[PDB]
Design an enzyme around this catalytic site. Sequence first.
Site, PDB file in Angstrom:
ATOM      1  CB  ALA D  44      -1.011  -0.031   1.133  1.00  0.00           C
ATOM      2  CB  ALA D  47      -0.094   1.542  -4.196  1.00  0.00           C
ATOM      3  CD  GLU D  48      -1.626   7.579  -0.757  1.00  0.00           C
ATOM      4  OE1 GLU D  48      -2.389   6.588  -0.853  1.00  0.00           O
ATOM      5  OE2 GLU D  48      -2.012   8.712  -0.386  1.00  0.00           O
ATOM      6  CB  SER D  49       5.412   6.160  -2.484  1.00  0.00           C
ATOM      7  OG  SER D  49       6.587   6.839  -2.939  1.00  0.00           O
ATOM      8  CB  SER D  52       1.971  10.635  -4.489  1.00  0.00           C
ATOM      9  OG  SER D  52       2.508  11.915  -4.260  1.00  0.00           O
TER      10      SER D  52
END
EC number: 3.1.2.-
Lengths: 127, 127, 127, 127
Positions: D44, D47-49, D52
């Site tokens: 997770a 994915a976020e990093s 972004s």
Amino acid sequence: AIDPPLHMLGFEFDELSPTRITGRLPVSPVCCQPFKVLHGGVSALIAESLASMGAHMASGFKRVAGIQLSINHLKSADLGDLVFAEATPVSTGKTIQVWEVKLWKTTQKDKANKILISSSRVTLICN
Amino acid sequence: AIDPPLHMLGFEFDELSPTRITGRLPVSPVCCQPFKVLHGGVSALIAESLASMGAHMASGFKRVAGIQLSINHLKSADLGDLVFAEATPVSTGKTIQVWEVKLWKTTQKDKANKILISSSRVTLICN
Amino acid sequence: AIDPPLHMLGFEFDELSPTRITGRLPVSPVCCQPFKVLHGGVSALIAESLASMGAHMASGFKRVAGIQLSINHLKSADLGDLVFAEATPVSTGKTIQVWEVKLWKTTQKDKANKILISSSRVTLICN
Amino acid sequence: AIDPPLHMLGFEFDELSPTRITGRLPVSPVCCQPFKVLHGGVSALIAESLASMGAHMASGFKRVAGIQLSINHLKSADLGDLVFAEATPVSTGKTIQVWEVKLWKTTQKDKANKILISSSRVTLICN
């Protein structure tokens, strides 16, 4: 009329197979939220239906149940547009299947150019 | 008939306010996936509709659009059950609102006891 | 240090039980994405960890695996804020558990007022 | 060390462009939930990093913030495996971007064959 909601909305199936389900939806008044655009709930209803059909087929027509859906609504579609749906498996195991459902629109003005409006992932347990 | 596809499925709205939207759905044949349980897509369609009505109200009637929906299907509901729906805000800012929509069922046999069947989070962009 | 990522981030557990897991995270530099706000990925990492611990406990310490996470990032938190996390079950059956994880912040200036910044649903299969 | 928590976990970035971000992570003990498999929270966080970073690039370096993440965990990865990550845009508009992040593993025994373990959709608001 074995998915009555889809029938009611005017959805029409094109291809059914264990690896791919497609069909189409004219965006008619019954499909719209009140600004004369396609109801995001209708995209979600499509995603759930096609993914569940796919999973049933891919599982040897054993019982399946959708336990999670995640959908992104990327663009709106207008009354009078035509929507195309395609469901394919992202992952099939014996217990958990994950399907992706994509929706694209074409418009009155431009009918060639399929524009992606929705993308979904449906997680199903297969009994 | 402020949400036409929901109206056609038999949904009835009950309360509207900027912090809470409710209504009910008899689980009738038109609402079912083919094993005589409520269609998961219908639960999704309910979440999207009610969250959107909420956001439209909580924003002071600005234009709102659902851009993401995540729904957990926890339990099934059978043909003949009654479903109750409630949408309330998790976060309301100027640009993004997040609404939670819970669905419960009661049955013919047990009509007192609301059993949670679905829970959803809907992300909307406003104005 | 049995969840090494959480240990590395400076997370501290408060309560563990089969119905509730809490703890806290000072928002330190290692926790931040580059604008000196808490990394949304760190909120997601917390949600996954606490939900999995909860599920393990609620299942009789049988093996569990997270199969889906959905998280909404509602507000940012700044370097120097303090984050509080609480995981509770939304649904526990024998096969599928669904947990909710909420994160709140308090700030240097205002330390009383817990402001909700994140909410998550974690779906786990329990073996 | 353009994403500090990822750097500390052993992540290495590879390609950055407005349509594709990649990198790799050895599955080392710091990355594992306690049964010697890769922590779902770490997937997770990746994915976020990456989503972004992608959005920040595809927007021309405007400020971006993740507001929703949905991740499917399809398969586990073991201690000693190598994880490859790739983020690409599903939709880029002025206000909302949606990125898809796929994670694959290869193993000690089989290093040729990338096996998909995770797939994520990240919704970001820009400027």
